[PDB]
Amino acid sequence: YSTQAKIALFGALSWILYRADGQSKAHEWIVDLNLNVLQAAWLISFSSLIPFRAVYFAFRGMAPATASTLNGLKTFSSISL
Amino acid sequence: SVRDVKTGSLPTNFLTGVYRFWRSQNPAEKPHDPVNDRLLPAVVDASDKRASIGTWATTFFCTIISCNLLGLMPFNEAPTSGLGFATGLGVSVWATATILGLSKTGFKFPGHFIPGGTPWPMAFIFVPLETISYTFRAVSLGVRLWVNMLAGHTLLHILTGMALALPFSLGFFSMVPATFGVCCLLSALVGLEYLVAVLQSGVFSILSTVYVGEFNHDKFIGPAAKIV
Amino acid sequence: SVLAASKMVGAGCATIALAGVGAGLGVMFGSLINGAARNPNIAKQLVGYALLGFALTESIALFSLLVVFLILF
Amino acid sequence: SVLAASKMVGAGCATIALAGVGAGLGVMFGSLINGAARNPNIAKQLVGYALLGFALTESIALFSLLVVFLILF
Amino acid sequence: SVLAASKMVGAGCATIALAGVGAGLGVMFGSLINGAARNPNIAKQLVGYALLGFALTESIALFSLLVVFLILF
Amino acid sequence: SVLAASKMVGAGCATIALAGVGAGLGVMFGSLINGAARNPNIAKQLVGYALLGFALTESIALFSLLVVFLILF
Amino acid sequence: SVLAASKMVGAGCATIALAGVGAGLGVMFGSLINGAARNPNIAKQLVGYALLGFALTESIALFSLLVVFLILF
Amino acid sequence: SVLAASKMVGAGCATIALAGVGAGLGVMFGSLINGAARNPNIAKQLVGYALLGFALTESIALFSLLVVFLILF
Amino acid sequence: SVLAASKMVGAGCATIALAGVGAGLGVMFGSLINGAARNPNIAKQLVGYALLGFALTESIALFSLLVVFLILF
Amino acid sequence: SVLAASKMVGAGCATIALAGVGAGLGVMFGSLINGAARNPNIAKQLVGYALLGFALTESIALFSLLVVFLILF
Amino acid sequence: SVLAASKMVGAGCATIALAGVGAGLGVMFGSLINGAARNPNIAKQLVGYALLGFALTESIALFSLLVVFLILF
Amino acid sequence: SVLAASKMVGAGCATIALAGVGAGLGVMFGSLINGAARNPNIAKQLVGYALLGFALTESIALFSLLVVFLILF
């Protein structure tokens, strides 16, 4: 964990503690605490549903500069002997 | 010397698929002759007075996703649920689709009346009916994004605000008759709210690309000497 | 205070306009599917026409919810 | 003050005209899609006819919201 | 003053006639598009027949708003 | 005077019959256009049948506005 | 005198049956036009069947206005 | 005497069942005409089936007016 | 005695279920006629299926008039 | 006793859900007949699918009459 | 106690959402039958798609009865 | 306390928008089945278009239940 990443660590963990404390001090608190165990139940389920080796080769085909391989210079018309 | 970017990384390939999609929504008009090496000074100039619609959409699409994606991150709430952000991008497309109309005419406000004959009291109501159907193009574009992130979120409180009551009024061991069927109902709305949040942006920005792309109609200025 | 009371009845009655808006963009999105049935070789134009009509149907949906918040707030 | 009270009930009841306006420009924009299904070679005329009928359907939508603001303001 | 009060309720109820007028000139302008689907070689006659029926449908729209202003003014 | 008051509420409620009259002569004039789509070589008979059915649909439109003026005047 | 008062509210509510009667003889007279589209060589039988169904639809229109005058007079 | 008063409101509300009965035997008599469009060589069987369904639709029309006179008389 | 009064209002409101029952066995008996249009060589099976669905539609008609007499008697 | 009074009004209003249930299994049993029109050689599968959908439509009919007896009894 | 009284009126009015849910899964199960009319050689996919849409239509039926028990209990 | 009373009547009246939402995604999911009838060789695009329109129909369903909880809570 580099210097730049640790600032993004407790710049996103101290966001949680700023905000998960902001869920208890509100009015409907247990309406909002059970809201977030349910909302992260799809963060779990999306991890084990999508095929990451098939989304990646879909986004590898998303751009024509990386999907189709290069055809710039054939090896004939480039030799010198 | 910012960063050595990888050549084929994932947000490089994800972004330029999006940008070549929105740029593909308003392509330039096929010109009135074969594109020579002398028509090129009118092709780079008709691609100059063209409004750069490809980045004005991707600005309003890589924001509306990344703001509504936070509505499905845990503990967080999407900033588009406020009225002060959702219609902050609602008027400012209808602003932008008006500034072009106030630029293709040269003036700063036209809108006056041209006369007619016997249907002239008939044609007097319609252009200030088109105006009130042009003014409500703004409010329609804003609140539509504001509700869909407050509609699936005011309900989803109360689905949580009832489903808890069955393990509250009844015991924790009593999940078998009803709770497991209801906890499957509640979870099946964040599955709905995911597909609304990914797609409300894709609606919102394709509306922006239609509502601007009816203003940048231009013409070529290379007919000066054809055959010689 | 019947002024702030009787606007709550017409609050709910105002949103019945959003019944037929729901029924409107059902047949509108029904014939999208029957429209792609005849020639799915070119149907991006038809969905490119389908997001036109949905945007003008939300210009009835929001056009009725302009009144509901005008009654409430 | 039932004068400024009872107009709030008929405020919401006035906008139920915008139900069938929503259902009207659904089938109107439904058959746009089935209309482009038969011959998408020429369909700019049909969308050029579709923006005609939407403008005359908003001459029912605004024609009912002429009454709503006449009741309120 | 229930005389000037109760006419405000029937004011909004009178405009519900403009629901089906909106639904009327939707299918009327729907089949305009399906009508130009069969033979767009000659369709200026059909739009020349479409502005006939819209004018006689506004002879229901104004024919109901004749009553609304008769109740109000 | 609730006698001359409560007839103003049922005044507006009486004209909601003119919703579906508007929706009635929409599909009636919709299929006029789809009717001329199949054979516009002979369609003066069909419009000669279309003014038959409109006259019998105004025998519902006026047949409901017979009641509205019976309530008012 | 709520007896002669409350019958005036149900007077207007009774005539909402004449909404769908209007919508009924619209599609009934719509398919008259699409019926003459297929074979206008013989269509006097179809109009000879169309005045049958209109007479049995006015046996719903008058069948509801039997109640309205029973409430009033 | 709200007993003999409040039955007059539900008197008119009871006859709204005769809306969709009117809309029912419209499409029922609409497809009679489209039914004779396909083969008018044999259509006395179809009208012989059409008077079957009208008699069973008046077994909804009278089946609702059984209630109206039960409320009144 | 609002107990025996207010059940008379919901008496008439209960029978509005018999609107769409009437509209239900219209299209149900409409497609009987279009069903005999395709092959009247064998249509006693179709009418033998048509009296099935009418009996299950009267299991909605009586299923709503079970409530009306439960309110009255 | 408005508690046992006002539930009688919402008793009748609760059964209006059984309008569109009646209209639902009309078109559901309409297309049964048009479904047997295309191929009556194999239609026991289609009626074997028709009793599936009627059972799931009575899971709306009883699903609304679950509420009516919950209000009454 | 109008608090526990007036929720009984909106109890019955809340279930009118289950009208069009009934009408929704009628045409949804109507076109199941017309869908098996075109190719009953492969129709287990279509019924495999029909139980998809019924489950998402009961996500409107229960989605309205979520409100009814929220009003009652 | 008519303020917290009269919002319970417009609570139930607000959800009648979810009638035609139910009827909207019935024909929307009806033509899904007729859409797979023409070419089930490629129908994952059509269901890939069907989950588009359902998500925009729930942008009417939740768009009306945004108002109901705004009235209640």
Residue numbers in the entry:
A (entry chain N): 71 to 151
B (entry chain M): 96 to 323
C (entry chain A), D (entry chain J), E (entry chain I), F (entry chain H), G (entry chain G), H (entry chain F), ...: 54 to 126
The authors write:
Mitochondrial ATP synthase uses the energy of the electrochemical proton gradient across the inner mitochondrial membrane to produce ATP from ADP and phosphate by rotary catalysis. ATP synthases consist of the catalytic F1 head and the Fo subcomplex in the membrane. Rotation is driven by protons flowing down the membrane gradient through the Fo subcomplex. A conserved glutamate (cGlu111 in Polytomella) serves as the c-subunit proton-binding site.
We determined the structure of a 1.6 MDa mitochondrial F1Fo ATP synthase dimer by single-particle electron cryo-microscopy. At 3.7 Å resolution, all Fo subunits, helices, loops, most sidechains and some lipids are well resolved. The best-defined region of the assembly includes subunit a, the c-ring interface and ASA 6, which was built de novo. Two prominent aqueous channels defined by subunit a and the 10-subunit c-ring rotor conduct protons to protonate and deprotonate a c-subunit glutamate in the middle of the membrane. The lumenal channel extends to a cluster of buried, closely spaced glutamates and histidines (aGlu172, aHis248, aHis252, aGlu288) that appears to serve as a local reservoir for protons to be fed to the c-ring glutamates. At aGlu288 about 20 Å below the lumenal membrane surface, the channel narrows to 4 by 5 Å and changes direction by 90° towards the c-ring. The matrix channel is defined by the N-terminal half of H5 (residues 221–239), the C-terminal half of H6 (301–312) and residues cTyr102 to cGlu111 of the outer helices of c-subunits A and J. Its deepest point is a 4 Å by 7 Å cavity next to cJGlu111, ~25 Å below the c-ring surface. The positively charged, strictly conserved aArg239 in H5 separates the lumenal and matrix channels, preventing proton leakage. The shortest distance between the lumenal and matrix channels on either side of aArg239 is ~6 Å. Our structure, in particular the small distance between channels, supports the notion that the force generated by the electrostatic field acting on the deprotonated cGlu111 gives rise to directional c-ring rotation.
